[PDB]
Structures are given as C-alpha cells and as structure tokens.
Amino acid sequence: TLNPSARIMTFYPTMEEFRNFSRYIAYIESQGAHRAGLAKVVPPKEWKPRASYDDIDDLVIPAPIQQLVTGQSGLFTQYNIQKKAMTVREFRKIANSDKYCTPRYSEFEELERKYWKNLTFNPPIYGADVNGTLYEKHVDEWNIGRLRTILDLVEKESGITIEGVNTPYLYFGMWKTSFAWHTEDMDLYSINYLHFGEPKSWYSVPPEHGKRLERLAKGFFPGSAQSCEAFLRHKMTLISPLMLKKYGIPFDKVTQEAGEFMITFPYGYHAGFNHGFNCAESTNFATRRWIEYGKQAVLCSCRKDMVKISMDVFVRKFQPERYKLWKAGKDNTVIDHTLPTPEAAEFLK
Numbered sequence: 001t002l003n004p005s006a007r008i009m010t011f012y013p014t015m016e017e018f019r020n021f022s023r024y025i026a027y028i029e030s031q032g033a034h035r036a037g038l039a040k041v042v043p044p045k046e047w048k049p050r051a052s053y054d055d056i057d058d059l060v061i062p063a064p065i066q067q068l069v070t071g072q073s074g075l076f077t078q079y080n081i082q083k084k085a086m087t088v089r090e091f092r093k094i095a096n097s098d099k100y101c102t103p104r105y106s107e108f109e110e111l112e113r114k115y116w117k118n119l120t121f122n123p124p125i126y127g128a129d130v131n132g133t134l135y136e137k138h139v140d141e142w143n144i145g146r147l148r149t150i151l152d153l154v155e156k157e158s159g160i161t162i163e164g165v166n167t168p169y170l171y172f173g174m175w176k177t178s179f180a181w182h183t184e185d186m187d188l189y190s191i192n193y194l195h196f197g198e199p200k201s202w203y204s205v206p207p208e209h210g211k212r213l214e215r216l217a218k219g220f221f222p223g224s225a226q227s228c229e230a231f232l233r234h235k236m237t238l239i240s241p242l243m244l245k246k247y248g249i250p251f252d253k254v255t256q257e258a259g260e261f262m263i264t265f266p267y268g269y270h271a272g273f274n275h276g277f278n279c280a281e282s283t284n285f286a287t288r289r290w291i292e293y294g295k296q297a298v299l300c301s302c303r304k305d306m307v308k309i310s311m312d313v314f315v316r317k318f319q320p321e322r323y324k325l326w327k328a329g330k331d332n333t334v335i336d337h338t339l340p341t342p343e344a345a346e347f348l349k
C-alpha cells in the first residue's frame with residue numbers, strides 16, 4: 001500500500017487546497033501520511049495567522065513548569081515543578097539568559113547529542129498548557145481555534161469543553177524543554193503550529209508499531225506499569241532514539257520550524273524538545289477514522305480529571321448499525337492503522 005516505509009512525510013498545499021482543513025487531512029491520509037504517526041505541512045507563503053507577535057510580551061503564563069529530569073542510559077522520568085506566574089517577556093528574558101540559552105552547534109545531530117547528554121542538568125522552565133490562541137480573529141484557514149471537524153460534536157451536544165482538546169493551548173519553550181512520549185487523549189489527532197522562535201524537534205513511532213513501544217516502556221518502567229494501564233499518558237517518560245534503535249522500535253525524526261504545521265495521528269506516539277525560546281499552539285481534532293480509536297483508547301486509570309470523552313454520540317451518529325452491538329460490549333472491530341479515513345475516498349479514485 002502507500003508509504004510502506006511509514007516515514008514522516010511533508011506537504012506543501014496551495015492556498016486552494018489549504019482552505020478546507022478536514023479535506024486536506026483526508027488527502028494526506030490518501031497518500032499514507034498517517035502511517036508514520038506524524039506529518040509536516042508547510043502552509044502557503046501567502047498565509048499568516050497573525051500580523052505581528054510583538055504585542056504579547058504582557059501575555060501571562062499562569063503556571064510555568066520547571067522540568068526536573070532524572071534517569072540514565074536513555075531512560076528518563078520527568079517531574080514537574082510549578083513556578084509562579086510570569087509574562088512572556090519575563091519568560092523570554094530567562095530563556096535567553098546565558099544560563100538557559102541554546103548551546104553552540106553546527107549540525108542538528110550535534111544539538112541532539114547535547115540534548116540527550118544534558119537533559120538531566122540545569123532544569124529549564126516550560127510555559128506550557130497556556131489557555132489562549134495567537135490566531136487573528138478573521139483567519140479562516142487552519143485556525144486552531146475553529147478547525148470545524150467532527151470533534152465539535154462534543155461541545156455542540158453536551159456543552160463540555162476540555163482545555164487543550166477542543167480549545168487551543170499555547171506553549172512557550174526554551175532550550176532543553178521537552179515533551180515525553182505519548183499519544184493524544186482518546187487517541188485523537190493533533191495539530192501543532194509553531195508561531196515563532198527556535199525549532200522544535202520531533203520523534204515519532206508508527207501507529208502500527210505503537211504496541212511495541214508500550215511493551216518496551218512497560219519493561220523499563222514496571223512500577224509505573226503496575227500502577228496504571230496507560231502510564232505513558234502522564235507524559236513523564238522520556239526514551240532516547242538510541243534506546244529505541246537498540247530494541248528495534250521503528251521510529252522517525254523531524255525538526256519543525258517556525259511557520260510550519262505538525263499533525264499527529266490517532267495512536268501515533270511522539271516526543272521531542274525545543275531548540276530554544278519559541279511559541280507553539282496546538283489542540284486536538286478528529287475524523288471518522290478516529291471514532292474507532294476513541295472507542296478503544298486505553299485510558300489512564302489512576303488520575304482524576306483525566307480526559308475521557310463519551311463515544312456514544314459518535315457511535316450513534318456514524319456507526320448506527322453497530323450501536324447496540326457496541327453498547328452491549330460486543331463490538332470487536334480490529335483497527336487497521338494503514339487504512340486512510342473514509343473522507344479520503346474521493347482521492348483514491
């Protein structure tokens with residue numbers, strides 16, 4: 001089938017193709033993009049979500065996070081220490097200080113080695129999970145604030161909003177800040193735009209090999225595994241690419257740059273780190289292909305306020321012939337990670 005390498009793909013849509021979000025996602029899936037779990041989409045040169053970013057210095061980061069990393073030989077656990085609120089100006093001041101700034105380097109392979117060699121030292125601050133958007137109110141193409149996908153059935157039918165899932169999150173980062181391995185809540189899709197700043201590097205494991213990654217993680221962190229069915233959802237586990245390589249876990253890497261979009265797919269494990277001071281925005285979204293992932297997503301069974309979406313409305317509206325079967329817990333549909341979402345039908349003929 002398509003993209004049998006399950007390698008990370010990059011797309012350059014024209015302004016025409018760009019306009020319909022859900023439609024372009026259907027397209028890239030018809031090209032096998034999802035098989036890698038992660039994909040890059042470079043927006044048209046004439047596209048910009050905001051005019052200028054010189055007016056956010058006063059924007060407040062209510063819960064900055066200091067990332068303490070503990071571990072050795074490729075396996076680490078990240079602990080969060082919440083610091084007092086601060087502004088984007090204060091944050092940047094710190095991000096650029098000779099204390100937390102980016103080390104000198106030539107090729108990316110070098111910055112990478114330095115990241116994996118010093119991530120346990122000099123714990124950085126991460127202005128993550130910040131409620132808000134940097135999109136201009138009139139931007140109608142790929143506006144994270146309103147992608148208009150079926151995930152809207154959640155708020156529209158129940159009124160329930162889940163910060164970060166069906167509302168945007170801003171992430172202000174600095175050198176060495178990172179994000180642990182994980183898939184989205186309810187195994188949804190994810191859209192990430194890097195408004196500005198230094199690059200953000202990503203690691204991705206193909207959804208078709210996700211179970212292998214979990215198996216490995218469970219063997220390394222048996223304690224966390226025995227305490228939770230999906231401890232990777234805590235987002236505290238870091239695993240180096242060398243360790244994955246050494247245990248035969250298929251994975252790919254890619255560096256996202258300011259102005260580019262990254263898309264993660266259902267059950268696509270990903271992790272990465274920021275090269276330096278930057279700002280990114282993200283939220284989740286869905287397609288009809290997601291519904292099945294949602295019904296089968298293995299959720300965190302030890303924390304409260306953990307994201308759990310009712311799959312009822314989706315199964316009832318898009319899988320009516322399986323609703324009673326599903327409701328009776330008799331629906332044993334097996335998921336094929338290679339198949340594109342049905343909306344991509346028009347692109348396969």
Ligand SMILES: O=C(O)CC[C@@H](O)C(=O)O
Pocket residue numbers: 128171178179190192264280282
């Ligand atoms: O987990 C993701 O989808 C990306 C998270 C990334 O934006 C971060 O800074 O944590």
Ligand SMILES: [Cl-]
Pocket residue numbers: 053054196
């Ligand atoms: Cl700026």
Ligand code: NI
Pocket residue numbers: 182183184190264270
């Ligand atoms: Ni994610």
Ligand SMILES: [Zn+2]
Pocket residue numbers: 228229230231234300301302303
């Ligand atoms: Zn848990």
